[PDB]
Design a protein around this nucleic acid. Structure first.
Lengths: 359, 157, 357, 351, 157
RNA sequence: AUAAACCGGGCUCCCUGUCGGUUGUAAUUGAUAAUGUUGAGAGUUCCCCGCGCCAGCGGGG
């Protein structure tokens, strides 16, 4: 069975500014010696994480913070009916490596992802360890013996199972180190973009000074893959089918979710025009299809999709890629040759993915 | 023989809003050559002498960040020169060191673009004729001196 | 027959940061007076060594460490069924030159490569020596006799056969010196690169952050030239006198990996899983790199990839004619005296068959 | 028919470190007031002498053996005024257990041995004990007599056993330090050592750079012929050919397993002369880069030649082999499409 | 190179039928569809493909009329004569935005607009200089046209 | 054939793991491109062939 699942997406956006930096400038990148517009992988990740679809098909997002005071209070309110305050405080203090007073500000080393399910589990363990006069060190060494038992709790924090976590303080260094299952790339345009500039003003209704905003439209190449085995491992040993279902939701989200930036004023609410999913032993990206920046003819979209299809033909024949592959597209013109099953709707695609690429 | 910097500065300050607007639209120094208002601006300041063209193109380009983005301030009578570009950029508290890093390593044209972004972002206070000399030569030595001044300033202040 | 095999790769990466330095800036190098982006040789090496292709087609990889306590416990664990505990401890001690207590902290002199197969073999030898109440320095005397018998074990440690090992303490200092059979160069881009910067933040779900200073991460894309050669004879020697066929096999695996494996750095957040667009293999009596093809840095025209491939091919013609290089050569390319190969597997086969299939 | 052969080579190395000092820092030199990366005379010469090409075409040459039998007559009347024929013939017989010329280091060492034999005759020392005293020296010279061409070309090994003053054998080929045609921007690599058993770091540094190197060498044909027992100019030219090939292909071995700067030279010019001259002043004023360092370096070379060649009296057959098609050099210098053709050209004295 | 004053003199002495027939084109390449053109420009090296594009441009401008472009030799003092932009500015008939939109006008859009300007302004100028400008016609020759125009207008006022 | 000659400073090594730059904003009001002008004249139209009363007529390019 194939371990890696690759998700390729071509999605065209109308004039927008979906990701910018500390100087209100669009994020770009250089590719093939020409400037592409860029949407950072962080942006995509958090857009997916916090989306509504995630909330309805995957669950609650992890709670990412650095303020342990607020976190203390939160954990009390959401767990108080299950544990003594002092078990909670002690668990937080052991995980974080800081002391949980009634101090107003208590800051961790960095912004870390916390999962309330996980913290609860640790609270149980700390409780029985409290009842047994077991010392903190021995508690640690004990817990280190069965890691999977802790990773099961990441089913209430699937995003962490996808993008991972690092720790530099507390027992989390030994316990809460998670290795991301999903690799995801910055989205870049398949063509050159010279951004436009909107010169604006604000009218003062009581009297009778121009600002600027950079923007652009563009056809974007999104890529991500998922390491099934590592996902299963990161979820406590979950099934391949549960893995495939999560991977499916990631396909959906990568084909429909869009960062929120400047959207109320530019509304680039576009859906993907092509989505290909492809099963593989070694993960590969199709970015090179657009190393030679796509030149427009009757748009950027069609030539980008054709460029994609061609590169995939060359790479698949050249490197002998026998893996399940399927392509959904809103365009009619000529797709990838017959080893790529065509999908009329996105849902048929997603079914085909849920079914390990055989349906 | 040498280019008057202060004259050009004041000229840019008193420019009519339309011309300033026309110049503020270049996205690259050489585009200034596509713009009538530019030639009208730099004509008194020796544009017609080929020796001074590149230089002038840079000066104006940086000024083209805004009508008062570059605040000039005279040096103190005691010290031999005024505030350097690096020092001012550092003094602003808005410029991150890596910006300067990538600036001094940038190719021709690109560096000036980046510089102008830094100037809009910082609104530095500096000795303009000094910066003007710097732009007049703008080579390895000058880029390096920029980053050095930045680093040492940020160090003490 | 030719002793050397040359592997050239042109591979193009999308935006990414495949190797960085002490300031977390992309590793670079100056070539032709212009800045190229660099992926170091050690990085490529470790990339291949820890890969899964390696694990499934070559075998186990060396274990590099300095913590003899941890290594102790590991070795006990995977050899306990064949050897006594202090046979194991003894062997470890004699090879490391440090005394193997039941201490929980025992430092070697430096991070060194440990092949487990090798250590098992030395375990058999030390067992023997223990049965005959033999003195250590005499066991050493005996073992210096037949070094090939020890290098035969590097077939379970091919990575050291390829990249070599230097020894400083214990009997290894006498028995362990391996001279690498594979020479491999730092990957550099065929073109000048001005690196981009990503300015990121972290949104704190419990406080609406206002003004903030953004973190930075240098990144870039680029067309890299990878080069490595393998000295077949020295491989054969490092493997205990293995046949040429086995050498060529391993070489073929090195070709594959050099054409497909990409270092792991920041790949979770930049995803540059690109295969190579050109692979050429070239048998020779004296190794020679094609790096000088890109000394005059490639200028872009419809990308950097194709112009690079053509620069490569042209320098190849000029050097082949200039230095009269009639040796088996083959080139695999994705783009439309050198035998052309449609697929990577055909190239691999060609290599397996000493360059005439 | 000039005495000296001059070899000039321009070779470009990709990022590497072919030669460093006691502080593991790349080797240095100032020229024209600016710093150039250097590869030492020593390093390069060793690169050549320990090569396989050298081994097969110098260490396994026909002229490599010196037969003492054929050297009896000439030896004896080159040594007749110092020694009686008895002592001579005894000595030569000891060493070994038609020709009219003899290599001076041979004459010298033979002389020393002779002296010893006479010395032992005066004390009626037993022959067995005599040999027992100088076993070593015998073995030594028996070795050196098997490596004629090698010694003629490169000189004596650093451990040779040569005793005399005529035994201080200089190489027929003189090899200069190699320096870069341009000022160098040196790079610094920052590496770590991952501990596969505690990956939870301590960094080390190695300096490295890339550059266009000017290699220069000369060959003293007369000296070669003399130290081969009076061999012909054709043969000496053969040897010269081999040295040209090597200076164009052989590269030092330092850190090449991890930096692999396995590059062939891009320009090779051979030039006959009465006075051997380096063209290093072509680069006294350091080359500035323009689409690389290679082309401008080559151009600077060519134009230096044009400017000073005849004035410096480099009137003698001259040929140039080069991969880069830059502006050609003076009509009088013959172009060569292949190294092999340049070699053949040298082999036949330059026409 | 191409002899200019020769081509001019040939154009001045062309027969009115050929002359009117040439004027009628609406795009330089349409000259290729006309015999009189070939006979005109053959003595001046049309047969050499290097010179072709150039000739097509030159004649096109000349096609404005037999006496629209008035040649005038440079004064012996001056190093160069009256360039096109100066001539146009001197006409008093051309608006700055015509010139601006001229230099920003695409291959081809460009020559058509220039010819319209020429007929409208009937400029007196050093013809061989114009010819050179037309021989190369790249970003900087266009930008130079705008320069001369703007700067002359400012000078004269 | 020079404090020279002969004459490697040389072997080993991931810089790795975590991270929306985000919220808000008419460029807006005024403005003939306007006055004057035969396209007239003029049978040349370059080649092959047929016929001719050598005035021209016709076939083919």
């Amino acid at each position: 069975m194939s371990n890696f699942i690759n998700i390729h997406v071509l999605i065209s956006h109308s004039p927008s500014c979906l990701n910018r930096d500390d100087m209100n400038m669009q994020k770009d990148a250089i590719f093939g010696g020409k400037r592409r517009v860029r949407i950072s992988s962080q942006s995509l990740k958090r857009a997916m994480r916090k989306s509504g679809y995630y909330a309805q098909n995957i669950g609650e997002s992890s709670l990412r913070t650095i303020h342990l005071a607020q976190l203390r209070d939160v954990l009390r309110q959401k767990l108080g009916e299950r544990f003594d305050q002092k078990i909670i405080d002690k668990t937080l203090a052991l995980l974080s490596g800081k002391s949980v007073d009634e101090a107003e500000k208590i800051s961790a080393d960095a912004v870390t992802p916390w999962v309330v399910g996980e913290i609860a589990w640790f609270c149980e363990q700390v409780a029985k360890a409290e009842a047994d006069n077991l010392d903190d060190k021995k508690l640690l060494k004990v817990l280190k013996e069965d890691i999977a038992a802790i990773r099961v709790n990441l089913q209430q924090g699937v995003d962490i199972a996808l993008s991972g976590r690092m720790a530099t303080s507390g027992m989390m260094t030994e316990l809460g180190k998670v290795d991301g299952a999903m690799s995801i790339a910055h989205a870049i345009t398949t063509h050159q973009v010279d951004s436009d500039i909107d010169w604006f003003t604000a009218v003062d209704d009581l009297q009778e000074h121009l600002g600027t905003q950079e923007f652009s439209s563009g056809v974007f190449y999104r890529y991500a893959n998922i390491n099934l085995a590592q996902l299963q491992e990161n979820l406590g040993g979950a099934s391949r089918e549960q893995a495939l279902e999560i991977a499916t939701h990631v396909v959906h989200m990568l084909a429909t979710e869009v960062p929120g930036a400047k959207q109320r004023t530019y509304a680039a609410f576009n859906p993907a025009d092509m989505v290909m999913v492809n099963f593989s032993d070694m993960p590969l990206s199709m970015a090179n299809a657009f190393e030679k920046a796509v030149k427009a003819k009757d748009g950027f979209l069609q030539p980008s999709i054709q460029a994609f299809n061609q590169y995939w033909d060359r790479v698949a024949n050249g490197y002998g890629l026998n893996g399940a592959a399927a392509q959904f597209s809103l365009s009619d013109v000529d797709p990838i040759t017959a080893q790529v099953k065509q999908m009329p709707t996105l849902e048929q695609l997603k079914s085909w993915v849920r079914n390990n690429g055989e349906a | 023989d040498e280019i008057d910097a202060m004259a050009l500065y004041r000229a840019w300050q008193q420019l009519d809003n339309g011309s300033c607007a026309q110049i503020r639209r270049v996205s690259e120094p050489d585009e200034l050559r596509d713009i009538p208002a530019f030639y009208r601006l730099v004509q008194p300041f020796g544009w017609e002498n080929p020796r001074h063209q590149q230089a002038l193109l840079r000066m104006v380009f940086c000024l083209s960040a805004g009508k008062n983005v570059i605040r000039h301030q005279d040096k103190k009578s005691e010290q031999t020169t005024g505030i350097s570009l690096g020092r001012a950029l550092a003094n602003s508290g808005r410029i991150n060191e890596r910006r300067i890093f990538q600036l001094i390593r940038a190719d021709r044209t690109a560096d000036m673009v980046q510089l102008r972004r830094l100037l809009t972002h910082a609104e530095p206070v500096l000795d303009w004729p000094l910066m003007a000399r710097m732009l007049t030569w703008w080579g390895k030595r000058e880029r390096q001196q920029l980053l050095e001044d930045f680093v040492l300033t940020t160090n003490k202040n």
